[PDB]
Paper text:
Here, we have studied the reactivity of HSA with I-picoplatin, solving two low-resolution structures of the I-picoplatin/HSA adduct. The HSA structure in its adduct with I-picoplatin has been refined to a resolution of 3.9 Å. The final model, which lacks four residues at the N-terminal tail, residues of loops 76–89 and 501–513 and a few residues at the C-terminal tail, refines to a crystallographic R-factor of 0.293 (Rfree = 0.327). The platinated HSA structure is almost identical to that in the absence of the metal compound: the protein retains its heart-shape due to the assembly of three helical domains (labeled I–III), each of which is divided into two subdomains (A and B) and to the presence of 17 disulfide bridges. Although the structure has been determined at low resolution, it shows unambiguous evidence of Pt binding sites. A total of three Pt binding sites were clearly identified in the Fourier difference and anomalous difference e. d. maps. Pt is found close to the side chains of His146, Met298, and Met329. Occupancy of Pt centers have been fixed at 0.50; B-factors of metal centers are 72.3, 82.9, and 78.7 Å2, respectively, in line with the B-factor values of coordinating residue atoms. Met298 and Met329 are cisplatin binding sites both in the absence and presence of fatty acids, while His146 was believed to be a cisplatin binding site only in the presence of fatty acids up to now. Although solved at low resolution, the new structure of platinated HSA clearly shows that the metal compound binds the side chains of His146, Met298, and Met329, suggesting that the compound reacts differently with the protein compared to cisplatin.
Here we investigated cytotoxicity and DNA and protein binding of an iodido analog of picoplatin, the cis-ammine-diiodido(2-methylpyridine)platinum(II) complex (I-picoplatin). Protein platination affects drug bioavailability and toxicity and plays an important role in the mechanism of action of anticancer Pt complexes. Binding of the metal compound to DNA model systems was investigated by ethidium bromide displacement assay and circular dichroism. Its reactivity with lysozyme (HEWL) and pancreatic RNase A was studied by X-ray diffraction and mass spectrometry experiments.
Author numbering: 5 to 76, 89 to 501, 513 to 570
The structure:
């Protein structure tokens, strides 16, 4: 039996949570209580199988069990079609109510009143809103969500304790979710071959000192971990993640110097810690690449005898000595390299043909460096909010077909690059910026996927995972596009209206001038300012 093998390895507590997540991600509209029942059933039944591994129905695969309980058009179908069904019925942008915390004391009452139902409530509410959230991590998040209610519902000021943590958790969760979503899209839309390269790139950067052989292994195991979490095999995802976190730490010496602190801590902490570690120190005298990948007489041979292992050895070798480069860059270079080997090793003298393959890189490297230098100059020259509006406008013109809420949402997140990254030294900027941008752009891509309007966005999204940022950056304003025919709010709130309006304002006269925007923007802000001052406000808002 299988249920048991998991229940055992994961423990009831975590089992129970995961199983919840699994469900709330699959059916996002279905009410809270409705799930908890299904959970508890599954949980009781598991226990039976723990007692009698040869009991009735314990012979089944988790998918079948889960799908079944859930089913109490997809349900008219059977494994595996059925599961793929639910997997493809996942909604990235549910019409689910805005999430809002009732007054502190109200929560602090409920937390002591019913501590379990309370956490299950949290997992439930997040999971249905982030159907691709990294299940294991969501546990970390939940424990740290408990830890704040434990403390802050037990102090002088609750509000100035609790809320400040919850603002940090929402932020962090939003990032993790978005980051994970990229992982899942990479896998599902570009296949594992592609994710593998990504991993090989990133891990070679986290763990420079590690021999290729080790990195390949890690990449395998990790790819397995994610594949599962994205295919909705969360239980196994978490176990496998654990087993991996346990592996890494045993062999620490051969991986990184940095892991010690991480490896010392509990199951949940360390998996996150590790995920988040700093890059190990760049090893000393590493023979220049060119020797083995340009000067060698056996390039054209090794690319024949093992293109994958060779190109991997390459990606590895280049990545480990470039923590300054984005992953997506490194991938591009890798692609350029593959490409060029292809053409050259079909020539008269290949040694000659490919000999200059590094010259090809200068462009691909520079194109990003400039772009970052410039909008970091810009960022510091504008500050984050204003900075967001420039991106807003820039992009809105590029893709005036995209829904306003999406435009706002994405723009704003593009905005944070500046504050996130521009404070770092150049050395650490690009991998910060570009790879963050690659996440944000993926949010666009998926939100867009749902309800497609703009062949340009689609082109960029589907054509190549790695070249998206350049594809988008490239885009000039859309000429084809046919122009489109409260006071008691927080700053962040006011911002999102103003911005929302800004988009409509651009959609109205795309061939606007920054000045005749300044003019309309201001006008309207003044309008709202006056109509806030009061009388019969609504009578004022008459226009
Ligand atoms: Pt959220
Ligand atoms: Pt090698």
């Amino acid at each position: 039996s299988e249920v048991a093998h998991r229940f055992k390895d994961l423990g009831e507590e975590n089992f129970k949570a995961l199983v919840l997540i699994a469900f709330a991600q699959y059916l996002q509209q279905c009410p809270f209580e409705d799930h908890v029942k299904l959970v508890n059933e599954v949980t009781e039944f598991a226990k039976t199988c723990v007692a009698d591994e040869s009991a009735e129905n314990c012979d089944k695969s988790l998918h079948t069990l889960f799908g079944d309980k859930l089913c109490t058009d997809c349900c008219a179908k059977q494994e595996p079609e059925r599961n793929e069904c639910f997997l493809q019925h996942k909604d990235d942008n549910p019409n689910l109510p805005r999430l809002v915390r009732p007054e502190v004391d109200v929560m602090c009452t409920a937390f002591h009143d019913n501590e379990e139902t309370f956490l299950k409530k949290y997992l439930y509410e997040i999971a249905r809103r982030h159907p691709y959230f990294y299940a294991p991590e969501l546990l970390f998040f939940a424990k740290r969500y408990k830890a704040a209610f434990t403390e802050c519902c037990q102090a002088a000021d609750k509000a100035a304790c609790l809320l400040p943590k919850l603002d940090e958790l929402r932020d962090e969760g939003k990032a993790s979710s978005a980051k994970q979503r990229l992982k899942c899209a990479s896998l599902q839309k570009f296949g594992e071959r592609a994710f593998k390269a990504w991993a090989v790139a990133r891990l070679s950067q986290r763990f420079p000192k590690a021999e290729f052989a080790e990195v390949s292994k890690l990449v395998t195991d990790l790819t397995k971990v994610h594949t599962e979490c994205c295919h909705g095999d969360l239980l196994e995802c978490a176990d496998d993640r654990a087993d991996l976190a346990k592996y890494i730490c045993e062999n620490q010496d051969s991986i990184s110097s940095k892991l010690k602190e991480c490896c010392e801590k509990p199951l949940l902490e360390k998996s996150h810690c590790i995920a988040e570690v700093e890059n190990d120190e760049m090893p000393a005298d590493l023979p220049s690449l060119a020797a083995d990948f340009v000067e060698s007489k056996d390039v054209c041979k090794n690319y024949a005898e093992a293109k994958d292992v060779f190109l991997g050895m390459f990606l590895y070798e280049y990545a480990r000595r470039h923590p300054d480069y984005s992953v997506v860059l490194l991938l591009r270079l890798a692609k350029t390299y593959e490409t060029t080997l292809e053409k050259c090793c079909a020539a008269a003298d290949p040694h000659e043909c490919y000999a200059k393959v590094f010259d090809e890189f200068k462009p691909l490297v520079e194109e990003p460096q400039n772009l970052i230098k410039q909008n970091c100059e810009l960022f510091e020259q504008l500050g984050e909010y204003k900075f967001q509006n420039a991106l807003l406008v820039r992009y809105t013109k590029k893709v005036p077909q995209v829904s306003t809420p999406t435009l706002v949402e994405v723009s704003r997140n593009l905005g944070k690059v500046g504050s996130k990254c521009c404070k770092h030294p150049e050395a650490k900027r690009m991998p910060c910026a570009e790879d963050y941008l690659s996440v944000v752009l993926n949010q666009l891509c998926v939100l867009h996927e749902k309800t497609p309007v703009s062949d340009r966005v689609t082109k960029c999204c589907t054509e190549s995972l790695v070249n998206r940022r350049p594809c988008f950056s490239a885009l000039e304003v859309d000429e084809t596009y046919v122009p489109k025919e409260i006071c008691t709010l927080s700053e962040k709130e006011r911002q999102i209206k103003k911005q929302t309006a800004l988009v409509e304002l651009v959609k109205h006269k795309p061939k606007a001038t920054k000045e005749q925007l300044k003019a309309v923007m201001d006008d309207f802000a003044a309008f709202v300012e006056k109509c806030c001052k009061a009388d019969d406000k609504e009578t004022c808002f008459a226009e």
